[PDB]
Design a protein around this nucleic acid. Sequence first.
RNA 1: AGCCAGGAUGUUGGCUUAGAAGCAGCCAUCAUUUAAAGAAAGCGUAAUAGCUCACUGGUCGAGUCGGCCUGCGCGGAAGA
Lengths: 361, 131, 141, 38
Amino acid sequence: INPVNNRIQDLTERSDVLRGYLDYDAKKERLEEVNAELEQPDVWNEPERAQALGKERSSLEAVVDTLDQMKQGLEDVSGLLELAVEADDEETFNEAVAELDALEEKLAQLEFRRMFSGEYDSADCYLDIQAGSGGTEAQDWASMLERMYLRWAESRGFKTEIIEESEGEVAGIKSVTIKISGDYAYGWLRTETGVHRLVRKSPFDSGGRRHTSFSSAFVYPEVDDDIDIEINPADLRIDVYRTSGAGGQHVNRTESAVRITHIPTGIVTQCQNDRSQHKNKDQAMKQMKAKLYELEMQKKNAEKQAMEDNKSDIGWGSQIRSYVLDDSRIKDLRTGVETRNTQAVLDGSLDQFIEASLKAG
Amino acid sequence: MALNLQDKQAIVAEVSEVAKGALSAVVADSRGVTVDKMTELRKAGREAGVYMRVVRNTLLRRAVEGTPFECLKDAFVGPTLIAYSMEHPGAAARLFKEFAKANAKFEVKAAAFEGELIPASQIDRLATLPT
Amino acid sequence: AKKVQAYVKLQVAAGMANPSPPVGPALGQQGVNIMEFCKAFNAKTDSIEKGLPIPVVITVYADRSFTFVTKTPPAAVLLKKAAGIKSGSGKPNKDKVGKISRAQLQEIAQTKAADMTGADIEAMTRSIEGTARSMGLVVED
Amino acid sequence: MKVRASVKKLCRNCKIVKRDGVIRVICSAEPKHKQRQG
RNA sequence: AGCCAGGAUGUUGGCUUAGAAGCAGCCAUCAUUUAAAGAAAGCGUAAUAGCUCACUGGUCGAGUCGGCCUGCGCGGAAGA
Ligand SMILES: [Mg+2]
Ligand SMILES: [Mg+2]
Ligand SMILES: [Mg+2]
Ligand SMILES: [Mg+2]
Ligand SMILES: [Zn+2]
């Protein structure tokens, strides 16, 4: 028919998922309820509420006001060339060409919303893939799931770097660590944390029967340059006193010992090893430098442990995709995308398993 | 003002506006209101011309020094703030009346209103407008 | 008794309609009738233009009655409709705009002076030429 | 009122005064600029 | 130096067309009405609103103001 007009029905294909997910009718209808909330004289007495809302109304704009104009252009961009192809108006033929860029850039305005989820989207990330027990079949599938994403990362233009590796005793691997390098590395693979599921007839067992083996693929950026010891002497109360006393008249007179008490925290750091106050100062400053940074490593782990506590209670909800190769069927159990193209999946056909997975997530 | 160069420039420009104009209509209106200065300064550029500028440099040795060539009775308009206004585009035309309508439009004051010329003298309120 | 004491100059975007949600509580400082202005807002745009920001001048007299004074649209948006550009200043050596012809600027000059006053309107014609130059927009003959 | 060995006019309204021979800075706008000694 | 008036015009001026609208990082320094007005010196309010100074006139009307070179002092200067 027309590659120009079918492209419009393909922008429609990208639009309808966003129409159904965020509910652009109810997402629109939410705005008029908060217009009357904001249109009020007694909203000045809660300025924090209005400041939280004054941009919240604008957050609803770029979602609704983009889609509200987007539905109008579907008939408009298609109907422009439809009248231009009849009269063969070559200028009007070229007029609808820029019209194809009208809604697509608006769709790109929603692409901001697609990548809005995240604070390290453009950061480089790691691809850590651990294998389940499963005998050797799970060892092989970790390798089969390695090259699943290793073929895909190079299929899109991302730099693939293999940092760590651990091979199988018989065949396959055990736990490989790939570092995907480039911009938007962690952004696309953010929806890849979670266990993957394989169902196939295992070739490793002699009487080969259908094994249901699993593999997990946890990703994380691990990119930082900010380390704060907070050795600022506005803190760190210094207390100097004299030792126990074994060296006669001298050590009982010299205030050699020293204590380092942190002002915000309260941990004390004493040192009375050497004989000079100048020498015990640097050692007590060193031990305080250790005990303060090691307190920071526990608060890093405390927030990390509470982060896992929202993940350990999930259980059988950490499964991502079901690769049932006995009947040649793929099941993304999160969203509900079924595909019958397992030979093409291993090439890295997961673009269908991202557009459905990431925008809805 | 720096010195004589800028000072005489205020004089010389006013000097050229005496020789060809005839009327002497004055006001001591302190309130140069935003709209009123967009009215009385528009009216000259709507009726007469852009010769009429604000100047209340009324000092007996300053503005009189700007007019020692014609109508030396302008000297006795030497005291306190007063806006001089001649009339070139039609000698002694109706610049006075509509300007006095501003007095009926709440122009604050006009100290010792006299209709200075075209009697060639004082108090006469200029009923006759030779247009 | 009151004529001009509750003076306001407002009216962000005239291209849309129904001022009640965004600017409704602005006239709600004194309790002004929202629809009487909403109709007057819409009885102002439909006659002239309904697609760009135009400013209004309102003053509410005694019994909560107000008079209207429409104002000419600002050159920042009037030359955003004339030149039709989404560029602007802030970056003279990074993002400047193309030129505007003099007569097209004169067409604006006819419209600006028709909604304003002044001694010499041709003098105010050059004043806009400096404004567009400060917006990163070149203007020529 | 701040006690500093070096006093200066922090604002326009900030004036200087030598009350009892003791330099001091007083203000009629922001009563936060009052200074002494100097 | 005081006491009296204004302190404007487009301009709610382009942020990226959430909010500083003479006021956070925004840019840039326009032309006119002109005795006179910087798209700005401060306070202020999500923002505005509002009150002064810049600069200019009237007025009681004379010397006055800002630095530099220096003599001698002042504060900084709290211990048994
Ligand atoms: Mg005393
Ligand atoms: Mg003084
Ligand atoms: Mg000394
Ligand atoms: Mg002393
Ligand atoms: Zn002060």
